[PDB]
Structure formats: structure tokens, C-alpha cells
Amino acid sequence: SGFRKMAFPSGKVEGCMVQVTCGTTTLNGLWLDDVVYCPRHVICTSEDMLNPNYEDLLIRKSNHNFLVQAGNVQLRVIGHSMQNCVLKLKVDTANPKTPKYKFVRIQPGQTFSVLACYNGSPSGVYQCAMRPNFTIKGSFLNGSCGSVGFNIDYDCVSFCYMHHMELPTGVHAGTDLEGNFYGPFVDRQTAQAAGTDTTITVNVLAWLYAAVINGDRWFLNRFTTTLNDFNLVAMKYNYEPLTQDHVDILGPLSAQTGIAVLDMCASLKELLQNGMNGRTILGSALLEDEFTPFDVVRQCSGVTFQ
């Protein structure tokens, strides 16, 4: 029993974190096999921030202009290249702590663990979600660039996010490990702003199913809804549309609890209309949207508390 924002154990990623310095700029890199990945903006200087020409900045660098430090050991850079917004530094040593890993680009609504690091050293681990507006609501200070997000289903680390910058509203933007930004953002200090965010409806429904699994039914009702009527209502509360794909993926939780997906949709409709009337759900007075259906199955019992 219980239900917490649960991250993956971070050790497999901790063993890959290094410090990368170019000029006066230091940030974090990810050392996998004989390659260190980091944000390409490590090669910018103060004037370069608004309209950097990264190709022109990079051609002026030699391998020895990049200082890579793994704990107390300096790694020797023997090649470099840029892929989209990431720099790849080839080093002369394969990381002996490289886990089984892959790179995955995620979709809005997906969650992942973040290992926030400074100067190549881990500070802490927490769970995030890719928001519908392609930002994440992280906790990042100056020097956290190059920190990564990941999942570890089944002993293989899937790296899905590298941190690049903070937007004016205090939320965060970054890339996949191929260097492609999530959302419309660019690694320039020109004015950029997150779009209006919305609530991840499929995740709220998953969390309501988690609440039922853990023993609470107070928010259910005798009603149902069509999918289209549900979406017409939910969008009036700035909820994302629920698709048939979302209905399908909720099937297993629906089967475990005996509550049809569209019947849970009717419960959510009523919660948006009424509030909680001084109650909580899984320790929250708000509707939580950063647990996916997969996360709920990962964390909750397979036996409903009836």
C-alpha cells in the first residue's frame, strides 16, 4: 500500500556523469562507452548567446580545448562532433560503468526520472513528466545543464532527456540524446516562452484507478459518458483530449478494478465540477497528472483492495 512519486534507482546513471569544461563554461556530460554527450552550448561565450553559429564556433576548437573530468580523473578527448544540439566528445577510455542502455525520444505525457547534477556530481533524483507544451517542471539551478532523464524498465537504461535551459516561467527545456529539442525551443537566448500548458487527462485517469486499487471509491458515481461528451467537458478545464489510444491503454487498469474507462471518465467529470469537498485522493487535494498508466501498474498491487 501507499503511493509515491517514485523514481528509478539512479546508480546506473550516476556512474556515467562527468564534468565538461570549454573556455570558462562548465556543465555536465554523459559518458557512455567511449563517448561523452553534452549540450553544444558549452562552446558559447557571453556574446555568443543570442545568435551563436555553432558550426563556426566548433571549427575553432581542438580536442584539447575540451576538459572532461570523471571524478578525479581527466579523460583525453580524441575527437568531437556535433549532432543537432548535442556535442559528442570521443574519449580514449570506454566508461567501465556503462550500463545496458538505449536512447528513446518520448511523447508528451510520458514520465521519467531526472538525476540533477552539478560539476559532474549527482545532487538528487526526482520524477518528471513531459508536459503537453514540451516543457518539464524540473528543479534545476545554474550548472545543471547536461543532467539527464531516464527510465529503467527491465535493467536497461532508456535515456530520454538532456537538460539545456530554463524558460521565463521557471520550467525547463531540453533535448533527446540525439540532440533534437522537445518542442519549438532553440539553444539561443532570444525571447522564447512555453505555450499554455494543459493537464494530462490519461494520467489523471490512471491515478484515479490507482486510488481505487489502493482502496478508495468515494469519487465514483453511477453515470457514464460518451468519449466525445467527455472531451467537450474536459477541454473546458484545460484538459488534453482523451483519445481511443488512451482508452485502450487504460484497459488493464479497468479490468483490474472492474470500472469501465468511460465510467471513470464520468467520475473525473464530476470531480472537476465539484472538487474534493475537503477530501484527498492518494494524499493530494489536486488531481495529479504525472503518473502514467504504466507507472501505476509498476507501483501498485495487482490485487485491488475491494
Give the footprint of Cl ion on this chain (CB under 5 A): 106-107, 110
The DSSP secondary-structure symbol of 130 reads -
Grid coordinates of 222: 453511477
- Is 242:234 a contact under the CB 8 Å cutoff? yes
Round to whole Å and give the CA distance between 37 and 179. 9
Q: 3-state SS of 64-76?
A: HHEEEEECCEEEC
Contacts for 188-196: CB closer than 8 Å, 24+ residues apart: 188/49, 188/50, 188/51, 188/52, 189/49, 189/50, 190/50, 190/51, 192/167, 193/167, 193/168, 193/169, 194/133, 194/134, 194/135, 194/167, 194/169, 195/133, 196/133, 196/238
Residue 222-261 contact track with Na ion, rule CB under 5 A, x = bound: -x--------------------------------------
- Is 284:275 a contact under the CB 8 Å cutoff? no
Find the binder of a second copy among 12, 163, 164, 246 (CB under 8 A).
12
83 binds a second copy (CB under 8 A): no
Q: Which is nearer to a second copy, 189 or 304 (CB)?
A: 304
Closest distance to a second copy from the beta carbon of 281 (Å): 11
Closest distance to Na ion from the beta carbon of 223 (Å): 5
Closest distance to a second copy from the beta carbon of 222 (Å): 27
Q: Which is nearer to Na ion, 43 or 265 (CB)?
A: 265
Residue 183-222 contact track with a second copy, rule CB under 8 A, x = bound: -------------------------------xx-------
Q: Which is nearer to Na ion, 136 or 205 (CB)?
A: 205
- Is 76:61 a contact under the CB 8 Å cutoff? no
3-class secondary structure, 112: strand
Find the binder of a second copy among 79, 94, 124, 217 (CB under 8 A).
124
305 binds a second copy (CB under 8 A): yes
Round to whole Å and give the CA distance between 302 and 300. 6
Rounded to 5 degrees, φ, ψ at 123 are -105, -40
- Catalytic, 16? Answer no
Q: Which is nearer to a second copy, 151 or 225 (CB)?
A: 151
266 binds Na ion (CB under 5 A): yes
Catalytic residue among 22, 38, 41, 160: 41
Catalytic residue among 16, 22, 145, 265: 145
Closest distance to Cl ion from the beta carbon of 130 (Å): 8
Give the residue carrying C-alpha cell 474536459.
234
Total residues found in the chain within this entry: 306
Closest distance to Cl ion from the beta carbon of 283 (Å): 23
Within positions 140 to 179, which residues make up the interface with a second copy, using CB under 8 A? Answer: 140-144, 166, 170-172
- Catalytic, 246? Answer no
Give the residue carrying C-alpha cell 512555453.
194
Residue 70 pairs in a beta bridge with 73
Residues labelled catalytic:
41, 145
| Interface ranges with a second copy (CB under 8 A) | 1-12, 14-15, 115-119, 121-128, 137-144, 166, 170-172, 214-215, 280, 283-286, 299-305
| Interface ranges with Na ion (CB under 5 A) | 221, 223, 263, 266
